Amino acid sequence: KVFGRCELAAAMKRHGLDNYRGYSLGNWVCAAKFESNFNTQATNRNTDGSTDYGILQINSRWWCNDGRTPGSRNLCNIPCSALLSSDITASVNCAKKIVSDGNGMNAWVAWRNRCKGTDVQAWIRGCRL
């Protein structure tokens, strides 16, 4: 499913991402836009052999099980296919764990290089909040 901008903002808010660990809702919408272009089924293979999955590009190296990433962990305790659903609940729960692991939203390279320091409030502008 490819989400609209205000549709994902509403979904993220409902699931308690707004201001989670001090990150405003626009920071999460910005990270989705550049990681997946709002597409729940996005997949991308890394050079190390791991794969990033879903609207927030979660890594099978540490967080989910895809069966082909040797030496990896499964800290969110889910199959990586569960991150590819139309319902974002599984992605959001895993994201909450990632952002608390001690480097904040720096864990997302697209956030660090493209969202961090910018006017993120622009992403949620015009949505009924």
Q: How was this structure determined?
A: electron diffraction
Q: Is 52 a catalytic residue?
A: yes
Resolution value, angstrom units: 1.7
SS (H, E, C) the chain: CECCHHHHHHHHHHCCCCCECCECHHHHHHHHHHHHCCECCCEEECCCCCEEECCCCEECCCCCECCCCCCCCCCCCCEHHHHHCCCCHHHHHHHHHHHCCCCHHHHCHHHHHHCCCCCHHHHHCCCCC
Q: Which of 7, 18, 48, 52 is catalytic?
A: 52
Q: Is 35 a catalytic residue?
A: yes
Least Cα distance to 98 among 85, 117, 115, 111 occurs for: 111
Q: Is 48 annotated as a binding residue?
A: no
Report all structural domains of the chain as residue ranges with CATH numbers, in order of start.
1-129 (1.10.530.10)
